Design an enzyme around this catalytic site. Structure first.
Site, PDB file in Angstrom:
ATOM      1  N   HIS A 170       5.776   6.297  -2.614  1.00  0.00           N
ATOM      2  CA  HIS A 170       7.059   6.941  -2.876  1.00  0.00           C
ATOM      3  C   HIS A 170       6.857   8.358  -3.392  1.00  0.00           C
ATOM      4  CE1 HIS A 170       8.592   2.578  -3.710  1.00  0.00           C
ATOM      5  NE2 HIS A 170       8.484   2.820  -2.417  1.00  0.00           N
ATOM      6  N   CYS A 177       0.837  -1.190   0.000  1.00  0.00           N
ATOM      7  CA  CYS A 177       0.000   0.000   0.000  1.00  0.00           C
ATOM      8  C   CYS A 177       0.877   1.248   0.000  1.00  0.00           C
ATOM      9  CB  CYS A 177      -0.954  -0.007   1.199  1.00  0.00           C
ATOM     10  SG  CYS A 177      -0.167   0.216   2.805  1.00  0.00           S
ATOM     11  N   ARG A 198      11.968  -3.847   8.052  1.00  0.00           N
ATOM     12  CA  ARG A 198      12.945  -3.523   6.978  1.00  0.00           C
ATOM     13  C   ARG A 198      14.326  -3.340   7.616  1.00  0.00           C
ATOM     14  NH1 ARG A 198      13.583   1.210   3.830  1.00  0.00           N
ATOM     15  NH2 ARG A 198      13.521   1.030   1.553  1.00  0.00           N
ATOM     16  N   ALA A 244       2.922   1.747   3.178  1.00  0.00           N
ATOM     17  CA  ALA A 244       4.166   0.986   3.177  1.00  0.00           C
ATOM     18  C   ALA A 244       5.229   1.672   2.330  1.00  0.00           C
ATOM     19  CB  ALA A 244       3.909  -0.432   2.674  1.00  0.00           C
TER      20      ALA A 244
HETATM   21  S1  CLF Z   1      -4.117  -0.493   3.233  1.00  0.00           S
HETATM   22 FE1  CLF Z   1      -2.115   0.202   4.027  1.00  0.00          FE
HETATM   23  S2  CLF Z   1      -1.584  -1.460   5.438  1.00  0.00           S
HETATM   24 FE2  CLF Z   1      -3.817  -1.622   5.172  1.00  0.00          FE
HETATM   25  S3  CLF Z   1      -4.966  -0.469   7.094  1.00  0.00           S
HETATM   26 FE3  CLF Z   1      -4.669   0.760   5.039  1.00  0.00          FE
HETATM   27  S4  CLF Z   1      -2.744   1.970   5.325  1.00  0.00           S
HETATM   28 FE4  CLF Z   1      -2.740   0.096   6.605  1.00  0.00          FE
HETATM   29 FE5  CLF Z   1      -3.267  -1.589   9.761  1.00  0.00          FE
HETATM   30  S5  CLF Z   1      -5.194  -1.054  10.780  1.00  0.00           S
HETATM   31 FE6  CLF Z   1      -5.436  -3.301  10.308  1.00  0.00          FE
HETATM   32  S6  CLF Z   1      -3.654  -3.665   8.929  1.00  0.00           S
HETATM   33 FE7  CLF Z   1      -5.317  -2.711   7.660  1.00  0.00          FE
HETATM   34  S7  CLF Z   1      -7.178  -3.340   8.793  1.00  0.00           S
HETATM   35 FE8  CLF Z   1      -7.137  -1.149   9.521  1.00  0.00          FE
END
Ligand code: CLF
Ligand code: ICS
Ligand code: CLF
Ligand SMILES: [Fe+3]
Ligand SMILES: [Fe+3]
EC number: 1.18.6.1
Lengths: 522, 477, 522, 477
Positions: free
Chosen positions: B192, B59, B93, B62
């Site tokens: 990015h 995402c 990481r 990330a």
């Molecule tokens: S697409 Fe990206 S990783 Fe996903 S949440 Fe959104 S920013 Fe994060 Fe963190 S809290 Fe749990 S894992 Fe998600 S469902 Fe709500």
């Protein structure tokens, strides 16, 4: 520079003189780093009591939490059913994070899909995403069942899973007879254990709510076992083994030990073992249902008593001597089967180990953290050994669980100095293990940094860590251990006594300084 | 090999998908032709993933917090939202750094807002301000705060830019709000881009009026190197043995002061084009600083990059570059002599994110190993252009591959070695094909530079020639 | 001085300032101790190759040996039979030492008697001692059988056990039908494993030599298993489990796991389990006999092939992956039962564990010591993991065993830098690990002192110890581990990889110095 | 109480033995009468054990090498004979010491001849000389050598005295041959006697003509304290706080120089009368040095012994003793106040070697605990004369008890706590009765002095009141 015959990785290659000079030049020239004395002074201040008072006054900032979000537990619960694909309705980054987390903990492949909702779905919903994802998943990975959970995106948007799946079946993306249970798992409510509970309740509802007319309690002469959020395969194995020795018919629901321990023989098995659909459908016919972790299976318990009309026993987690005995006696009462001689022999062997190790175990101080049921069972086992818990932390605990743990501690003379904290993170625990130093900590891998901090204050202030819980990333194959039952108690006792002995051996290894106590026999 | 056989394989793999999925996924797999320069005619990338196909993409959060902003050590990064995102991305990481964690460095620490239902219903701006005050109280030696947004923040009507402005004016501190919600974009590439825009808008121009910094003709800035396993360090020393002064590195072992000092350098050495091309172009436009790409994977690429960099300076820098190459020649020659016989003739298939899938081919070719298949998670067609020239003839190219597609491709091609992430490591280890993690270096490294080449060769030999791969079939079956 | 709220044991109470002053005064005034610089110089000299050359030239002095005497193994063998009393015909000091040794290793009661021979028995023999001891032992402890071994006193004197026992039965000290097997166990020949072999051969002879007329090979459709000198209960448990998973009828001879793991339920059990006399008498009727440790069961093999007419298979110890496979295939061929799917799944899981840990396991250097079969199996398993054994030591090994180990090492590229030493003690191993430093050692508790010595040379020269073998005195409940089979291989792999990971974590715990490599994920 | 039922118990236990065994074992068990001081008319001790009865006694080698000679740190002790004897006795006793093991201290090291069949057939004197040469070569900083004989040495007829004399003349070194073969005597008592004779004949008189040592009227020598868990240290500090100078220390943390300087002291404080009475009586005859017994188990015995010792010196030593008692009073008072309520009313049965079975009763009564049964492994009749006056009325006394006798006595009496060796620890732990190792202090200690009293009380409380003793019976049984 590297020697071909002795190649050095980052450690200790970056301890060479040239690398040290280059790092020092970088820091002195361009980093604008604070002076070393200021850093030492601020560290010393952070190790003090006034910093602890400032730290415990936090109301909005969470540093180094000790929990996760609900869809992780939902995926873990879905992984425990036969040929079942976990399907998270929402964003993909979540599923990537879940898979990475579980891969790192278990060192095994983890399968989970998402419908990859994007910005457009932020204004039109994820109905088209759900239809296309269900069709694609069924066509590609060919599961017997798809278990649907949600991320925070779909929860905040307001996506209705029931209507979406109903529309997918009508239009013709998935056959009408295809089982697609669903559960809402908001990440801003509870933690991963709550997600496990929601997923299991959703699956049980889907499979048993509309067919209770012909169900009679005690028809199949079995006992349902709901293990909850569990990351030790040895716990599933020991529960099955104990129920097998007693000759008791049982039905384990959400059994993921097979899919998380597949052999490496040349093929990749996407699915393995798990609870079947017929087991879930016949669950209402059992004599009773036993919940292994009752403190995060409240919704499941409400559904089981409300619908299946099962008188769920008030049983603690089968952790340690007394609670294992209570669980075994309750199972014997429900099934009518006497407890065999092998289990009594195993209990006697555990008691013998306790008597052997009591000299070293007595009076030790432990901080510990983890999930509510695991923490409470470990506290009970520590109290049975004569150890003294001091800092008991549970980030995802609640007031009723804290009251129960306080009641457990008040019944033992060794719980006099114990304090229970709920809603506190690992930074709070760093302050506690600094200001009130225990002998050891018991927790997941995230505690290692705390240990490092203590070692910075001095060798006499270091608090070693013992890795029991979830997740463990810096050690290999510790997920195969057992924690429940007599076997789990023996393993925990051995780990504790041997950690104490290793620490004593390390403290007394200095020749002509402390090696007078470097005894051969302990 | 046998282009038509690979096309038949692609069609056979594509048969299982539904019509829409088949049509969309047919465009993301191709045969490589080194003569063709424009990859838009053969491969389509940077598109949304098909639902329910178990993609490997991440995402935008990330891409921004995990990749760009995270390695900054003296700043505190708040994962604004629920607790899961920061927990899963904490210390995952291997961006290495030097500092006192919890006092003046905070890379492996997880700061989060820990959103609940009340914060969702009523917003979290007041909670954000209280959190900033608490961070100021408990971490006085922090030199800046970034607020990385997660999905609910974008979904609900939260305006963190005004909170950041007011708190930065109040505490005289640099607070950078990053709108890195995970539902934006299709992968980490937009993360990015958003992180680069945040750096440009809130950090880069803070020393525009300052001239106190004494500059030197040999000032360079490393951009796009995240010090995975110390990689950036193993590059930096070489640049300092050439006679150059490295003012900044982005962003592994990086500091906010280095980012501020970057516009004062004479050249920008960009390692990862995919993540830092935006900021490199902005710096070239606004300050006139030229930028160039360099590759330090393997002795050949390292020497070529060193000579190309030295060509941008005077004769003394070129002389020192020649001295460095001559000094380091025996070491990598010995490494090659020891490890090439054990690795000659082996075939490799790779699947990494934006840059590595085409940057590592040189070291593999230096060890006598041929790459037959490669692909990207979130690269754009510009990256696929470079790769098509970089990669071999009649070889396989894949963009945003699915688990089933990748498994079938490996089952048919049967390479000797695979380089990918943690989510395919165990899948391919169960099938009996040696696997190396190409993201975290399998908790080893560094791999850049002459020092990293030895570790790379040693790891390749230890995994490819491990006895465990000869023991999967039981003798009785 | 002591604080009532915080009481210190010897460590660190003797680190107080007053105790330090008193010790310094004593040493400076009355000990006439060598100057500290001279001590440091002599230590530094003892860590060089020149000293190693002097050390390896030894011909008459043994320092820190790695073996025991035969009657200890004879007692261990006798403890494996049902209601059998070990009886050592000689002096009582031997029996006291054997009981102390086994109590310390197993943390369980050990039963063994002696006839208490003294100087009068040195002048006139110990026949009256044997008569009185047999009568007293049978009257008091009521065993089903008394198994007689000897000490060095009786061996040097020349006491004839056969004539003494025959005279005891005629005169009427013990009933004629009472089984009293005997074996000569001279402590100046071989080691404890030789004593185990002698005792087992004596028992088998006593029970089967004079009744071979009606014996037919393969009548009972069973396989005899002789485990040899074994101090891991998990090894007995794992052999029987795999043979039952295979549906193979088996007869385990000298099974002591029951008497060495009695439960603590309020009653003391002097005897528990063990091989019955009927099993020993019916042993010649088995399909074949399998020796688990063939390198110290040579006399037993000669007796079994010569008298029972069993074609003993040439099987190595079931250690690691390849040898366990060979043992299972040989058992399947002998019995005819196919290998089930559970064992194949367990083997695949072991291979998966190997593939997971190979990155950290590859290239590590180990010195190791112990018994011949255990050392050879551990060396084979290390070669299977890609590890490099460098110093292989076996005090009680012989030239043919060394040749076999060299042949094993020459078949693998990882055994290029390996050297096998026979007849060398732990002082030689200390010199070896000082001059050619390995990464780790694998041995019993006696290696801990070696580690201390290395730590005195420096932290960079320290060679950590891994406790696998016999005896382990400074850790608790490690005798319950498993070493043979896939389960034992998994346990050994986990121990090795986790010791490596703990060492790496310790070496990289210094903040701002080496903590850049203190990775959460390993 | 109830002497008649105890006699009935003794007869009931004795019923099972054969005729001769019954009549021999009847004389070794008795009821205690504090009024009678002649135990010869009541209990017979120091006799051979009955064969096949699983006695707890050791051998003369254990008494000599394990007990007396072993704690000497700067000498090398060679177990001359086969390997088992030295293997089982290595580092099994917790005689603490300060030194560099392998360089100038050798207590935990195992030197042995490793006799084989040839050394049995042809003797081992040449091998002994070669071994002495190798010891000299590889351990130059050793200050003495002792040769502890085992059973084969006495059986085959080896003249180790001549070898010791020749090599001592050759290398100008002190070599002490000890004829401590295990078949001699009936227990470790003869080993103690033989080791004392060796000390007298080969070490003690080496400085008879030497007068360069400056002597003080407050010079004392501790004899018979083996520094178990540091016990001797916790005694010596007290003697240092009285103004006394401790020159020697036999034998825990002891050096050969201290043994040599012992005949220069003004008083011999003997802790273990059983093992060092021989050497004490000789030093009173040949040197005129008076000796006295002292007890440091518990505050009462410690104070009584301190005052008795100070009575032999001038008024300044008595004043210092009073100061020491006053200083240490609050500490042991606090220990008593904390631990007596948890231990009051408990009953103890003891069985240790030759001294402790009567020396610890004082501390046990100081913590309000009653001893109902006691006994010895290898004590003589004077030890029982000393024990009878210290032990309760109509209480049980046993000499060289067997396993069956001890088990039956504990099963009938049912005490709260038991103190014995490692060979009964697990037996009595499996019967659900708390057990404390009275030899090695259960790898704890020290127990001597005011400092050791706190540890002793804490250990007694931690074992006697452990929850594990309440969990032996299953709830369904
Ligand atoms: S697409 Fe990206 S990783 Fe996903 S949440 Fe959104 S920013 Fe994060 Fe963190 S809290 Fe749990 S894992 Fe998600 S469902 Fe709500
Ligand atoms: S020497 Fe004796 S058996 Fe007096 S052989 Fe034994 S360290 Fe005992 S009762 Mo172990 S006559 Fe010392 C003894 Fe007492 S070893 Fe220790 S505790 S005070
Ligand atoms: S009574 Fe005493 S301890 Fe016994 S032997 Fe004799 S000196 Fe020694 Fe060592 S070697 Fe083994 S245990 Fe004996 S049988 Fe030969
Ligand atoms: Fe795995
Ligand atoms: Fe035990």
């Amino acid at each position: 520079s590297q020697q071909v015959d002795k190649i050095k990785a980052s450690y200790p290659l970056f301890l060479d003189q040239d690398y040290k000079d280059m790092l020092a030049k970088k820091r002195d020239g361009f980093e604008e780093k604070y002076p070393q004395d200021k850093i030492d002074e601020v560290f010393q201040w952070t190790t003090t009591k006034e910093y602890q008072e400032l730290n415990f006054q936090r109301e909005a900032l969470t540093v180094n939490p000790a929990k996760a979000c609900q869809p992780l537990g939902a995926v873990l619960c879905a992984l425990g059913f036969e040929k079942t694909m976990p399907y998270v309705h929402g964003s993909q980054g979540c599923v990537a994070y879940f898979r990475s987390y579980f891969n790192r903990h278990f060192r095994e492949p983890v399968s989970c899909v998402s419908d990859s909702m994007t910005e457009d779905a932020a204004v039109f919903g994820g109905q088209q995403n759900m239809k296309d994802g269900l069709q694609n998943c069924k066509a590609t990975y060919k599961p017997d069942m798809i278990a649907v959970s949600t991320t925070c995106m779909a929860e905040v948007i307001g996506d209705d899973l029931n209507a979406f799946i109903n529309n997918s079946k009508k239009e013709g993306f998935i056959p009408d007879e295809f089982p697609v249970p669903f559960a809402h798992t908001p990440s801003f409510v509870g933690s991963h254990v709550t997600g496990w509970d929601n997923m299991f309740e959703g699956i049980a509802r889907y499979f048993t709510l509309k067919s209770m007319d012909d169900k009679v309690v005690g028809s199949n002469k079995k006992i349902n076992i709901v293990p909850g959020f569990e990351t030790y395969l040895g716990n599933f194995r020991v529960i099955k083994r104990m129920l097998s020795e007693m000759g008791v018919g049982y039905s384990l629901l959400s059994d993921p030990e097979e899919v998380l321990d597949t052999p490496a023989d040349g093929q990749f098995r996407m699915y393995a073992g798990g609870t079947t659909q017929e087991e879930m459908k016949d669950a209402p016919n059992a004599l009773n249902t036993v919940l292994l972790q009752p403190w995060h299976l409240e919704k499941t318990k409400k559904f089981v008593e409300g619908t299946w009309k099962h008188e769920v026993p008030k049983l603690n987690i089968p952790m340690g001597l007394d609670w294992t005995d209570e669980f075994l006696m309750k199972v014997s009462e429900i099934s009518g089967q006497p407890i065999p001689a092998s289990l009594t022999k195993e209990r006697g062997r555990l008691v013998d180990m306790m008597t052997d190790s009591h000299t070293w175990l007595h009076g030790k101080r432990f901080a510990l953290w983890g999930d509510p049921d695991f923490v409470m069972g470990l506290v009970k086992f520590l109290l049975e050994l004569g150890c003294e818990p001091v800092h008991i932390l549970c980030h995802n605990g609640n007031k009723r669980w804290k009251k129960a743990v306080d009641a457990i501690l008040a019944a033992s003379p060794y719980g006099k100095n114990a304090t229970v904290y709920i809603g506190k993170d690992l930074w709070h625990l760093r302050s506690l293990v600094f200001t009130d130093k225990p002998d050891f900590m018991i927790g997941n891998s995230y505690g290692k940094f705390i240990q490092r901090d203590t070692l910075h204050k001095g060798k006499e202030f270091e608090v070693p860590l013992i890795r029991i819980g979830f997740p463990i990333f810096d050690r290999h194959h510790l997920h195969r251990s057992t924690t429940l039952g007599y076997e789990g108690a023996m393993q925990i006792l051995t780990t504790l006594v041997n950690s104490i002995l290793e620490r004593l051996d390390e403290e007394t290894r200095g020749m002509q300084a402390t090696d007078y106590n470097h005894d051969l026999v302990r | 090999m046998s282009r038509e056989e690979v096309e038949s394989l692609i069609q056979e793999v594509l048969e299982v998908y539904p019509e829409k999925a088949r049509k969309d996924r047919n465009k993301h797999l191709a045969v490589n032709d080194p003569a063709v320069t424009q990859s838009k005619k053969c491969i389509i990338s940077n598109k949304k993933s098909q639902p329910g196909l178990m993609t490997i993409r991440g995402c935008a959060y990330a891409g921004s917090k995990g990749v760009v902003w995270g390695p900054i050590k003296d700043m505190i990064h708040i994962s604004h939202g629920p607790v899961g995102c920061g927990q899963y991305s904490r210390a995952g990481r291997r961006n290495y750094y030097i500092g006192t964690t919890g006092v003046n460095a905070f890379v492996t620490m997880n700061f989060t807002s820990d959103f609940q239902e009340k914060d969702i219903v009523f917003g979290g701006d007041k909670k954000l301000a209280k959190l900033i005050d608490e961070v100021e109280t408990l971490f006085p030696l922090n030199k800046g705060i970034s607020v990385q947004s997660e999905c609910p923040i974008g979904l609900i009507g939260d305006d963190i830019e005004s909170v950041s402005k007011v708190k930065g004016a109040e505490l005289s501190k640099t607070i950078v709000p990053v709108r890195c919600e995970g539902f934006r974009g299709v992968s980490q590439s937009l993360g990015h881009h958003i992180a680069n825009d945040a750096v440009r808008d809130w950090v880069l121009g803070k020393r525009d009026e300052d001239t106190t910094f004494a500059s030197t003709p040999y000032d360079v800035a490393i951009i796009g190197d995240y010090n995975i396993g110390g990689d950036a360090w193993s590059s930096r020393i070489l640049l300092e043995e050439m006679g150059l002064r490295c003012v900044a590195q982005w962003s592994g072992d990086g500091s906010i002061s280095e980012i501020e000092l970057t516009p004062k350098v004479k050249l920008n050495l960009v390692h990862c084009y995919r993540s830092m091309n935006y900021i490199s172009r902005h710096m070239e436009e606004k300050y006139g600083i030229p930028w160039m790409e360099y590759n330090f994977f393997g002795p050949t690429k390292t020497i070529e990059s060193l000579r190309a960099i030295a060509a941008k300076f005077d004769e003394s820098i070129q002389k020192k570059c020649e001295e460095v190459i001559a000094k380091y020649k025996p070491e990598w020659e010995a490494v090659v002599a020891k490890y090439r016989p054990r690795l000659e003739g082996k075939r490799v298939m790779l699947y990494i994110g934006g840059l590595r899938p085409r940057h590592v081919i040189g070291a593999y070719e230096d060890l006598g190993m041929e790459v037959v298949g490669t692909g990207y998670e979130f690269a754009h067609n510009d990256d696929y252009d470079r790769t098509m020239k970089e990669m071999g003839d009649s070889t396989l190219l894949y963009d945003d591959v699915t688990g089933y597609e990748f498994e079938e491709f490996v089952k048919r091609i049967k390479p000797d070695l695979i380089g990918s992430g943690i989510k395919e490591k165990f899948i391919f280890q169960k099938m009996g094909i040696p696997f190396r993690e190409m993201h975290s270096w399998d908790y080893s490294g560094p791999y850049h530079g002459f020092d990293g080449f030895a570790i790379f060769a040693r790891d390749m030999d230890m995994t490819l020639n491990n006895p465990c791969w000869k023991k999967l079939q039981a003798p009785w079956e």
